[PDB]
Write an enzyme that holds these catalytic residues in place. Structure first.
Site, PDB file in Angstrom:
ATOM      1  N   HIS B 458       0.799  -1.230   0.000  1.00  0.00           N
ATOM      2  CA  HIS B 458       0.000   0.000   0.000  1.00  0.00           C
ATOM      3  C   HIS B 458       0.825   1.270   0.000  1.00  0.00           C
ATOM      4  O   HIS B 458       1.839   1.377   0.689  1.00  0.00           O
ATOM      5  CB  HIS B 458      -0.789  -0.033   1.322  1.00  0.00           C
TER       6      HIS B 458
HETATM    7  C1  LIG Z   1       5.060   9.778   6.640  1.00  0.00           C
HETATM    8  C2  LIG Z   1       4.598   8.316   6.654  1.00  0.00           C
HETATM    9  C3  LIG Z   1       4.386   7.648   5.502  1.00  0.00           C
HETATM   10  C4  LIG Z   1       3.968   6.311   5.505  1.00  0.00           C
HETATM   11  N1  LIG Z   1       3.764   5.681   4.355  1.00  0.00           N
HETATM   12  C5  LIG Z   1       3.360   4.419   4.309  1.00  0.00           C
HETATM   13  C6  LIG Z   1       3.126   3.710   3.003  1.00  0.00           C
HETATM   14  O1  LIG Z   1       3.289   4.223   1.901  1.00  0.00           O
HETATM   15  N2  LIG Z   1       2.710   2.415   3.077  1.00  0.00           N
HETATM   16  C7  LIG Z   1       2.512   1.780   4.263  1.00  0.00           C
HETATM   17  O2  LIG Z   1       2.138   0.613   4.294  1.00  0.00           O
HETATM   18  N3  LIG Z   1       2.737   2.469   5.455  1.00  0.00           N
HETATM   19  C8  LIG Z   1       3.142   3.722   5.516  1.00  0.00           C
HETATM   20  N4  LIG Z   1       3.346   4.356   6.705  1.00  0.00           N
HETATM   21  C9  LIG Z   1       3.122   3.641   8.030  1.00  0.00           C
HETATM   22  C10 LIG Z   1       1.664   3.335   8.307  1.00  0.00           C
HETATM   23  O3  LIG Z   1       0.961   4.563   8.167  1.00  0.00           O
HETATM   24  C11 LIG Z   1       1.521   2.855   9.732  1.00  0.00           C
HETATM   25  O4  LIG Z   1       2.299   1.656   9.795  1.00  0.00           O
HETATM   26  C12 LIG Z   1       0.114   2.533  10.109  1.00  0.00           C
HETATM   27  O5  LIG Z   1      -0.743   3.686  10.013  1.00  0.00           O
HETATM   28  C13 LIG Z   1      -0.009   2.169  11.569  1.00  0.00           C
HETATM   29  O6  LIG Z   1      -1.422   2.192  11.806  1.00  0.00           O
HETATM   30  P1  LIG Z   1      -1.992   2.097  13.289  1.00  0.00           P
HETATM   31  O7  LIG Z   1      -3.474   1.945  13.191  1.00  0.00           O
HETATM   32  O8  LIG Z   1      -1.226   1.070  14.016  1.00  0.00           O
HETATM   33  O9  LIG Z   1      -1.683   3.542  13.789  1.00  0.00           O
HETATM   34  P2  LIG Z   1      -2.401   4.884  13.430  1.00  0.00           P
HETATM   35  O10 LIG Z   1      -2.941   5.188  12.097  1.00  0.00           O
HETATM   36  O11 LIG Z   1      -1.131   5.551  13.802  1.00  0.00           O
HETATM   37  O12 LIG Z   1      -3.534   5.263  14.478  1.00  0.00           O
HETATM   38  C14 LIG Z   1      -3.218   5.738  15.766  1.00  0.00           C
HETATM   39  C15 LIG Z   1      -4.363   6.658  16.177  1.00  0.00           C
HETATM   40  O13 LIG Z   1      -4.334   6.687  17.588  1.00  0.00           O
HETATM   41  C16 LIG Z   1      -4.676   8.021  18.049  1.00  0.00           C
HETATM   42  N5  LIG Z   1      -4.319   8.015  19.487  1.00  0.00           N
HETATM   43  C17 LIG Z   1      -3.050   8.021  20.031  1.00  0.00           C
HETATM   44  N6  LIG Z   1      -3.069   7.794  21.317  1.00  0.00           N
HETATM   45  C18 LIG Z   1      -4.376   8.118  21.644  1.00  0.00           C
HETATM   46  C19 LIG Z   1      -4.996   8.319  22.867  1.00  0.00           C
HETATM   47  N7  LIG Z   1      -4.323   8.211  24.008  1.00  0.00           N
HETATM   48  N8  LIG Z   1      -6.294   8.626  22.844  1.00  0.00           N
HETATM   49  C20 LIG Z   1      -6.944   8.729  21.695  1.00  0.00           C
HETATM   50  N9  LIG Z   1      -6.481   8.565  20.471  1.00  0.00           N
HETATM   51  C21 LIG Z   1      -5.165   8.256  20.538  1.00  0.00           C
HETATM   52  C22 LIG Z   1      -3.884   8.848  17.099  1.00  0.00           C
HETATM   53  O14 LIG Z   1      -4.448  10.170  17.074  1.00  0.00           O
HETATM   54  C23 LIG Z   1      -4.067   8.102  15.755  1.00  0.00           C
HETATM   55  O15 LIG Z   1      -5.168   8.602  15.002  1.00  0.00           O
HETATM   56  C24 LIG Z   1       3.759   5.653   6.743  1.00  0.00           C
HETATM   57  C25 LIG Z   1       3.981   6.364   7.933  1.00  0.00           C
HETATM   58  C26 LIG Z   1       4.388   7.647   7.911  1.00  0.00           C
HETATM   59  C27 LIG Z   1       4.623   8.391   9.193  1.00  0.00           C
HETATM   60  C1  LIG Z   2      -5.520   3.944   4.579  1.00  0.00           C
HETATM   61  C2  LIG Z   2      -6.387   3.781   3.358  1.00  0.00           C
HETATM   62  N1  LIG Z   2      -7.470   2.774   3.515  1.00  0.00           N
HETATM   63  C3  LIG Z   2      -7.263   1.441   2.808  1.00  0.00           C
HETATM   64  C4  LIG Z   2      -8.233   1.113   1.788  1.00  0.00           C
HETATM   65 CL1  LIG Z   2      -9.797   1.915   2.182  1.00  0.00          CL
HETATM   66  C5  LIG Z   2      -8.012   2.573   4.849  1.00  0.00           C
HETATM   67  C6  LIG Z   2      -7.998   1.229   5.536  1.00  0.00           C
HETATM   68  C7  LIG Z   2      -8.769   1.072   6.850  1.00  0.00           C
HETATM   69  C8  LIG Z   2      -9.998   0.132   6.689  1.00  0.00           C
HETATM   70  C9  LIG Z   2      -9.665  -1.041   5.778  1.00  0.00           C
HETATM   71  N2  LIG Z   2     -10.997   0.971   6.124  1.00  0.00           N
HETATM   72  C10 LIG Z   2     -11.798   0.956   5.062  1.00  0.00           C
HETATM   73  C11 LIG Z   2     -12.724   2.035   4.908  1.00  0.00           C
HETATM   74  C12 LIG Z   2     -12.827   3.106   5.847  1.00  0.00           C
HETATM   75  C13 LIG Z   2     -13.727   4.104   5.676  1.00  0.00           C
HETATM   76  C14 LIG Z   2     -14.592   4.082   4.572  1.00  0.00           C
HETATM   77 CL2  LIG Z   2     -15.749   5.352   4.383  1.00  0.00          CL
HETATM   78  C15 LIG Z   2     -14.551   3.078   3.646  1.00  0.00           C
HETATM   79  C16 LIG Z   2     -13.617   2.032   3.807  1.00  0.00           C
HETATM   80  N3  LIG Z   2     -13.559   1.024   2.902  1.00  0.00           N
HETATM   81  C17 LIG Z   2     -12.676  -0.014   3.009  1.00  0.00           C
HETATM   82  C18 LIG Z   2     -12.689  -1.021   2.016  1.00  0.00           C
HETATM   83  C19 LIG Z   2     -11.831  -2.059   2.093  1.00  0.00           C
HETATM   84  C20 LIG Z   2     -10.911  -2.151   3.159  1.00  0.00           C
HETATM   85  O1  LIG Z   2     -10.091  -3.261   3.105  1.00  0.00           O
HETATM   86  C21 LIG Z   2      -8.718  -3.032   2.827  1.00  0.00           C
HETATM   87  C22 LIG Z   2     -10.871  -1.200   4.131  1.00  0.00           C
HETATM   88  C23 LIG Z   2     -11.762  -0.095   4.082  1.00  0.00           C
END
Ligand SMILES: Cc1cc2nc3c(=O)[nH]c(=O)nc-3n(C[C@H](O)[C@H](O)[C@H](O)COP(=O)(O)OP(=O)(O)OC[C@H]3O[C@@H](n4cnc5c(N)ncnc54)[C@H](O)[C@@H]3O)c2cc1C
Ligand SMILES: *CCN(CCCl)CCC[C@H](C)/N=c1/c2ccc(Cl)cc2[nH]c2ccc(OC)cc12
Ligand SMILES: Cc1cc2nc3c(=O)[nH]c(=O)nc-3n(C[C@H](O)[C@H](O)[C@H](O)COP(=O)(O)OP(=O)(O)OC[C@H]3O[C@@H](n4cnc5c(N)ncnc54)[C@H](O)[C@@H]3O)c2cc1C
Ligand SMILES: *CCN(CCCl)CCC[C@H](C)/N=c1/c2ccc(Cl)cc2[nH]c2ccc(OC)cc12
Ligand SMILES: *CCN(CC*)CCC[C@H](C)/N=c1\c2ccc(Cl)cc2[nH]c2ccc(OC)cc12
Ligand SMILES: *CCN(CC*)CCC[C@H](C)/N=c1\c2ccc(Cl)cc2[nH]c2ccc(OC)cc12
EC number: 1.8.1.12
Lengths: 483, 484
Positions: B458
């Site tokens: 991704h």
């Molecule tokens: C600049 C950048 C580019 C990237 N590009 C890629 C890419 O191209 N492909 C790829 O596969 N991965 C990429 N990644 C990594 C990928 O985004 C992460 O591995 C992935 O999002 C981790 O998802 P998560 O759900 O574990 O964390 P997150 O998406 O990090 O969700 C964490 C959520 O927790 C919330 N949170 C924190 N603590 C609290 C709390 N105490 N109370 C309430 N809310 C809280 C935060 O606000 C956040 O919204 C990238 C990362 C960065 C930084």
């Molecule tokens: C970070 C970009 N997304 C990947 C493809 Cl949507 C988000 C992944 C999180 C989880 C899989 N969410 C979704 C969503 C979230 C919100 C909406 Cl409005 C629609 C979504 N549709 C999805 C369709 C398929 C998924 O499987 C990979 C995930 C989805």
């Protein structure tokens, strides 16, 4: 009053929520600190992928790539007044924000139309092993604004940039700030050898003003530690030829803010250089501190929440998935962990994620795509390893003027049985090519399965189906060749 | 018999066969072709269709045609310049295309020099007997013999040629061959055919067309790309249309007349009449058999092409046929493969044949198509239970690039009974590249679950393939069913 409470509405989190409320009809509570993207918390409904990661970087890299096409178009008969050519960073950011917003929005509407799924704005932490509090701030003293009681709690707080403790770090920014810059720096310094650093250097180099300059520095020998050595080498010459300056073995000592507003950077080596922007991209750390883990006895291993193959902590009913667990920080892995988790908890069968052989890419220019082991690890787990290597300048680059753009395809196998341990590519479209190949390694494909496949011509990918003789081997870590 | 092997044709199949025979088996090989370097009058030369008037040149040209899209879409990400100064130099494109092709023709010649046991003969080849091949100065069997070659084995690899229909005025039309040498891009052009050649060239012409130019594509059937997934045919049609290409289905040229201004008038059976500056016919290719004098050896011809068996053997011992000439699967890689299999079968310890099934391939249209395996229509007739998984979406960048009509289509067809994947069909940027590893997957008898249990890369378009878990519909004994 809730079956499941997820802290964080990121990729893992949402995936786990959604799945729980839909396929298992559970009452799910989800917590995040912001609804839409941007400062002050940067992250929001949608997580890093949506707001400050995957989505926006892809939009920007796609933007950065146009510099190549606009330059390369000339070789195929495309002309225009090149002197009228300019890049509008502001537009990029402007469209980037719309796109992100529409997704934050789409996510909000989702909680509305989904029963058993409720969203809660604020900071969340553990009171007890079954009590989760939503406060108005990260400070455990701030005002409770909700008290959620539940049987199961899932931690998905993600990670955060790591800022080193050097004098003047206050004059630097992390990747977060970078998605909101009002103007493109003329002279920028990105600190870090990793993907984030490399990707951004590519972005800044494209939208850089007239006599701009992008400088990338790394403390180690060569960029992209952990990736195939051939790609690291090739990638460096390509990035270089695109005018990016790479400092290796250089590590910032301090940043001082000059009078003109610029920043003076002093490297431990003694070197001094000026820059308008200093971006630190040296690492991401699990966001655990603000969860009050202690209030439940959940263990922490290497800054991250310890878990077992099933994503279970040391306190029954407390699970952790995603960046927070420091395994493989990729969006898809997070999403996958969540589903496995949910099944394992509210379903008939326990299921875990396979963190091995996961394909991934680096969106540099040119990009990289990879799957499986790098030779250096391979020769340590296997006695006989064969390396198949291919390097060529694609036709189109012969005619586009970018002769330095070499495509690199490398296949590594366990010579005893032909099994393919890793495939590494460098060159246009790599990210796209690596995908099916990811499926190939899940199927325990062997080199002959590749070369017995008929190629799609003409394409770069077809190279992978025409490597029959290894270039060299590793016999118990030593490099051998066929006389 | 002063030669072990004689190959008539120095294209993909022939060269591969020659090379393999002289290098791995140390055999004295003779190879014949009618020209050393590309271009008129014979178009083909050392290198064959792929090199001179096929794969190579069409990829360079399509590559060039894509810049029109990038140049247009750049605006969406903040790229500005004086768009009114934008022009395409067809002459440049042709100029670099020729240099690239020339260099390969040259590289080929050099190869004959440095390779012992490999000899090149310029001229027209034909059979005198089943062990005698003659090199004459022209395609006419009366022309002067310039060489008499005795050999134990003969390989036929003459390829195909454009098929011109016998309609009044065909002499005012051209084929794909002449298209690679046009000195100027036609203002109004008509491409005749529903196939890939016609579609790919439509996009080329459409990108380098002058001011108020117009590209028109006509096909006699219902919709372009017969033989490909119906969803791609429909989608591709809307997308080509939205880019300014006019498509006439159910139209079948009746005659072409040459007006005084030099234009060409085209009258369709339907009665319609339209004018064009160029009429390109792309209705098919036929195996080149007539000039071989097959009768002098008794080799049988089936449907215009040389009859062969799974091992590429003709009905006469020692006479083999590989490539376009055999009319099986007309793709460069298939020819290359058949030649290696053929060579092992004849001068090696083990007989080997090519698998013409599950061969991946692409259509370099804009956007392009990538495909592998059966199309639903054929699936539902060999299997009782077929599941069709279908995804459609507008990639992110196209939301912001301003090309909102560029939908990405991913389609997976399986044998519902066991989950085995029968075909994968894609439409959208980079499809050709995505399909390759997917080709390997179907050689390994992958099943839908192997796809979806793979973690995706991704963000990329390819990742969709790993996220289709539930079929949209099924075919039960050819009828379409659905889950309530
Ligand atoms: C600049 C950048 C580019 C990237 N590009 C890629 C890419 O191209 N492909 C790829 O596969 N991965 C990429 N990644 C990594 C990928 O985004 C992460 O591995 C992935 O999002 C981790 O998802 P998560 O759900 O574990 O964390 P997150 O998406 O990090 O969700 C964490 C959520 O927790 C919330 N949170 C924190 N603590 C609290 C709390 N105490 N109370 C309430 N809310 C809280 C935060 O606000 C956040 O919204 C990238 C990362 C960065 C930084
Ligand atoms: C970070 C970009 N997304 C990947 C493809 Cl949507 C988000 C992944 C999180 C989880 C899989 N969410 C979704 C969503 C979230 C919100 C909406 Cl409005 C629609 C979504 N549709 C999805 C369709 C398929 C998924 O499987 C990979 C995930 C989805
Ligand atoms: C416009 C176009 C685009 C194409 N694009 C693609 C693509 O993108 N991908 C793909 O896989 N395939 C493509 N193809 C098809 C592919 O080129 C052919 O399937 C392949 O070249 C056939 O190889 P061959 O060796 O059988 O034939 P050839 O390369 O056709 O070799 C035949 C050779 O024999 C010579 N010959 C003929 N008869 C005689 C004789 N009597 N004496 C001496 N010499 C003789 C000819 O001069 C010619 O060089 C394309 C074809 C065309 C026309
Ligand atoms: C039509 C484009 N080419 C495919 C890859 Cl080169 C030609 C294929 C024909 C045959 C396989 N020829 C070659 C050649 C021919 C001439 C030279 Cl100078 C070098 C070649 N190198 C090849 C390398 C690998 C091949 O396997 C696919 C084929 C080659
Ligand atoms: C009004 C209804 N929608 C918002 C506009 C709700 C969004 C539903 C989509 C389908 N969301 C998700 C998924 C759909 C389909 C599949 Cl197969 C999986 C899937 N997973 C997730 C995971 C997390 C998540 O949170 C945003 C949504 C979806
Ligand atoms: C001076 C020596 N060369 C010309 C410059 C001879 C070209 C040799 C290359 C290697 N040609 C071919 C091949 C190389 C490697 C492999 Cl594994 C396969 C291979 N196949 C063919 C098939 C046909 C052919 O004819 C041009 C050449 C090669």
């Amino acid at each position: 009053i809730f079956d499941l409470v997820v802290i964080g509405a990121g990729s893992g989190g949402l995936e786990a929520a959604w799945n729980a409320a839909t396929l298992y009809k559970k009452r799910v509570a989800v917590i995040d600190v912001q609804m839409v993207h941007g400062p002050p918390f940067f992250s929001a409904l949608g997580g890093t992928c949506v707001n400050v990661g995957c989505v926006p970087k892809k939009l920007m890299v796609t933007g950065a790539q146009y510099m190549e096409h606009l330059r390369e178009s000339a070789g195929f008969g495309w002309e225009f007044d090149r002197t009228t050519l300019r890049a509008e960073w502001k537009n990029l950011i402007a469209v980037k924000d719309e796109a992100v917003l529409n997704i934050n929005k789409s996510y909000d509407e989702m909680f509305r139309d989904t029963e058993g799924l409720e969203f809660f704005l604020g900071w969340g932490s553990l009171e007890s092993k079954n009590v989760v509090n939503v406060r108005e701030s990260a400070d455990p003293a701030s005002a409770v604004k909700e008290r959620l009681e539940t049987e199961h709690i899932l931690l998905a707080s993600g990670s955060w940039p790591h800022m080193p403790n050097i004098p003047g770090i206050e004059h630097c920014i992390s990747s977060n700030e970078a998605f909101y810059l009002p103007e493109p720096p003329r002279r920028v310094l990105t600190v870090g050898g990793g993907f984030i650093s490399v990707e951004f250097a590519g972005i800044f180099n494209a939208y850089k003003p007239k006599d701009g300059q992008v400088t990338l520095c790394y403390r180690g020998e060569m960029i992209l530690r952990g990736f195939d050595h051939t790609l690291r080498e090739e990638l460096t010459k390509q990035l270089t030829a695109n005018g990016i300056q790479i400092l290796t073995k250089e590590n910032p000592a301090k940043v001082e803010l000059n009078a003109d507003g610029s920043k003076s950077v002093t490297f431990e080596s003694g070197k001094k250089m000026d820059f308008d922007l200093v971006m630190m991209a040296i690492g991401r750390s699990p966001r655990t501190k603000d969860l009050q883990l202690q209030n439940a006895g959940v263990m922490i291993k290497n800054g991250g929440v310890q878990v077992d193959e099933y994503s279970r902590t040391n306190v029954s009913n407390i699970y952790a998935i995603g960046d927070v667990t420091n395994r493989v920080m990729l969006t898809p892995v997070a999403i996958n962990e969540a589903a496995a988790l949910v099944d394992t908890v509210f379903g008939t069968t326990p299921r875990k994620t396979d963190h091995t052989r996961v394909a991934s890419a680096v969106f540099s220019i040119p990009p990289i795509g990879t799957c499986g082991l790098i030779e250096e690890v391979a020769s340590k787990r296997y006695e006989v390893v064969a390396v198949y290597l291919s390097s060529f300048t694609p036709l189109m680059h012969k005619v586009s003027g970018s002769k330095y753009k070499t495509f690199v395809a490398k296949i590594i196998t366990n010579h005893s049985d032909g099994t393919v341990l890793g495939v590494h590519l460098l060159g246009d479209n790599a990210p796209e090519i690596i995908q099916g190949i990811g499926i190939c390694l899940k199927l325990n494909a062997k080199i002959s399965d590749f070369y017995n496949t008929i190629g799609v011509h003409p394409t770069s990918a077809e190279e992978l189906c025409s490597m029959r003789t290894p270039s060299y081997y590793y016999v118990k870590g030593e490099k051998m060749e066929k006389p």
